[PDB]
Amino acid sequence: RDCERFKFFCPKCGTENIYDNVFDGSGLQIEPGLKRCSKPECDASPLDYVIQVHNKLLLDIRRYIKKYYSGWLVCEEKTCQNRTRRLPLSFSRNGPICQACSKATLRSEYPEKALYTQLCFYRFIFDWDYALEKVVSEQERGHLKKKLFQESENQYKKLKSTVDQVLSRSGYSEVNLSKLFQ
């Protein structure tokens, strides 16, 4: 609920398309989100410009990684709310001590969990199988589990491969038992 949704500008009409689920619509009118543009007057199919969708996905992933590695810290005290990029070596039991007030802890503005959840959401909005099993209903699942959508399924699998590749390089799927047991 706190994750940014996938924004893609249609190459033809230039209208923003917000993607938050694999499938859009209800009943037999349900189709993959990247099949039709959000503008009724626009006939362009975003599935045609899947190279552009891939590029925008990579740019968004870079943006989120940059946000995480910016390392912005905010004081948890409402009356201080000090915002700094510098992590001080002076720590309390709860974490870094804010050097503006010297009495409250500095919390990450964009913690690791936020980035992990963002990448997981980008995977979610392209997970055909998961959407079919969980999100989609019975009649909708039947309508979507036929031909006329195989190409869309393949493109969605390719797009999910990108987010899967990125997540495979994240330390937030591996547990280092050396760090736990010492």
């Binding site: 190279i51 990684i65 940059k66 590695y69 910016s70 070596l89 870094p96 390089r169």
Partner: protein, 431 residues
């Protein structure tokens, strides 16, 4: 249009060392041995899992950096005891710490704070008053030792700032005593004009390589710039990986006649690669069987050994990053380069610039400078130069392309044991 009709092709914009003929020729990488500098620490040669930094780990890495540099400097200077930075000091005391800015802006003489390490100061900070220091040069993240007094317990007043101590140079073995002088052509991205994706400057540079037949060609990123106007606005009809693959194929196949060892260094601006520093080497391209021994996908930063000559290189714009934060009492680039060499790290700035993502465990493991390099390649948006900083030849070849107009590259000659004149000659030349 503008690039193709340029008139200053081949102009030598800067020169250093022994004068050479108007034409440079190399051995085509015949009697050449290129490897990664074999030091105690293992090099970065493969991807490391990132995006998971614990604040405790960052604290530990920064603290151990300060502690280790301070230990080396204490042994060198025969300093007796370090004192906690925060405690009051009526008499003169020696304090080890790192410099920083009291606010988020750019450092100035009235905003300097010294943060001590965990061992001697429990990580406490103290404001610094530079009124009694006659000469100084400070940048954030700089590990320093200062003699000073803290009469109020609230403001440290330095009276002496100990100078930096660079690492010793490399003592080459005799194995390469009989090898000839080696020619190195170094160029840095961007490789295409701002309004094109055809890599015209790269083609010109490849022609130069085949013409001069250098022994090593060091290409630094970006190879697919993230700031390219076409990339940002999503006008590309092919995936980023495809463009990068085409560029690498062009580079490798086009250099076949020259037989030149290619050293490819990634850049943080590479839109197709992992955005983390230290950057792992490129791994999306498999050279043909006839080019495996010629292509070296190295990490950013890299310390290379070429017939015993140690070349340090980084794609990161260190000079631009540190020039925006360095404060001095009264050549600025020479000061910054000496700071880099004396701190013994390829990125001593803390906090970093806004354009670089730093994984601090990887930074600790792969940014220490093993020795002081004979040649130090530091491409920068600033002007090209060839400087001699404490016996190290620091070369900024500029960038191959400067907006719509063509840029510059550099060519230098290196021989182990020459005369310390390991760099016979060097030249910044136009493309």
């Amino acid at each position: 249009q503008k690039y193709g009709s340029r008139t200053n092709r081949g102009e030598v914009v800067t020169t250093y060392g022994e004068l050479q003929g108007t034409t440079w020729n190399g051995g085509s990488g015949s009697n050449t041995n290129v490897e990664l500098f074999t030091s105690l620490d293992e090099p970065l040669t493969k991807m490391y899992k990132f995006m998971f930094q614990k604040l405790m780990d960052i604290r530990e890495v920064v603290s151990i950096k300060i502690e280790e540099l301070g230990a080396s400097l204490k042994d060198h200077f025969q300093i007796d005891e370090f004192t906690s930075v925060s405690l009051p000091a009526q008499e003169t005391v020696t304090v080890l710490g790192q410099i920083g800015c009291d606010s988020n802006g750019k450092l100035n003489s009235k905003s300097v704070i010294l943060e001590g390490d965990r061992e001697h100061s429990a990580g406490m900070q103290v404001p610094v008053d530079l009124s009694e220091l006659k000469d100084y040069s400070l940048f954030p993240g700089q590990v320093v030792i200062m003699e000073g007094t803290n009469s109020t317990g609230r403001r440290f007043v330095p009276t002496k700032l100990y100078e930096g101590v660079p690492l010793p140079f490399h003592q080459p073995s005799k194995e390469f005593e009989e090898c000839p002088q080696q020619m190195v052509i170094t160029a840095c991205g961007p490789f295409t004009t701002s309004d094109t994706i055809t890599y015209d400057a790269l083609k010109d540079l490849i022609d130069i390589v085949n013409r001069d037949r250098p022994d090593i060609c060091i290409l630094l990123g970006p190879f697919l710039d993230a700031k390219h106007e076409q990339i940002e606005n999503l006008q590309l009809t092919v995936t980023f990986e495809d463009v990068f693959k085409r560029c690498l194929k062009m580079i490798i196949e086009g250099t076949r006649p020259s037989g030149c060892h290619l050293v490819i260094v990634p850049s943080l601006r590479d839109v197709h690669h992992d955005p983390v520093y230290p950057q792992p080497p490129f791994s999306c391209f498999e050279p043909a069987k006839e080019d495996k021994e010629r292509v070296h996908f190295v990490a950013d930063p890299c310390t290379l050994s070429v017939n015993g000559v140690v070349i340090g290189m980084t794609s990161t714009d260190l000079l631009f990053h540190m020039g925006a934060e360095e404060i001095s009492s009264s050549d600025r680039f020479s000061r910054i380069l000496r700071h880099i060499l004396t701190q013994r790290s390829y990125y001593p700035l803390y906090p970093p610039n806004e354009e670089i993502n730093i994984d601090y465990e990887a930074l600790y493991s792969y940014t220490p400078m093993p020795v002081t390099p004979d040649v130090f390649i530091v491409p920068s948006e600033l002007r090209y130069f060839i400087k001699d900083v404490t016996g190290c030849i620091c070369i900024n070849p500029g960038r191959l392309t400067k907006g719509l107009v063509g840029g510059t590259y550099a060519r230098f000659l290196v021989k182990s044991g020459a005369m310390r004149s390991t760099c016979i000659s060097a030249q910044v030349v136009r493309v």
